[PDB]
UniProtKB/TrEMBL annotation, chain A:
This is Vp2. The chain holds residues 806 to 855 of 955 of the full protein.
UniProtKB/TrEMBL annotation, chain B:
The chain holds residues 906 to 955 of 955 of the full protein. This is Vp2. It comes from the Viruses.
């Protein structure tokens, strides 16, 4: 709507991307992860934090 | 020795003595750990992010 270039704003965070549901990871589990490189390659959603 | 001793004492042969001919009985093996080993001098710290 606003004409931004590569807008970081979505109307709602998508439930599915490319036909599959987006992974959701809490911040506490994300902070404690040691294989973050493998997980971040596919993209995820961070919640349970402000 | 035969005329001017008059008394003798005998004990069992000490086991620390080895005849020179039996010098293979003194061969033994000692094992030294590999020099590639690194010995840790730092304590382990426990933590959690939960």
């Amino acid at each position: 709507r606003f004409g931004f270039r590569d807008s970081p704003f979505c109307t709602s965070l998508p439930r599915t991307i490319m036909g599959n549901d987006v992974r959701r990871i809490s911040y506490n589990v994300f902070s404690m992860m040691e294989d973050i490189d493998d997980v971040i390659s596919e993209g995820f959603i961070l919640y349970d934090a402000y | 020795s035969k005329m001017n001793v008059s008394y003798r004492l005998y004990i069992k042969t000490p086991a620390c003595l080895l005849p020179l001919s039996d010098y293979m009985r003194a061969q033994h093996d000692y094992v030294s750990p590999s020099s590639s080993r690194v010995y840790i001098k730092d304590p382990a710290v426990v933590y959690t992010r939960s």
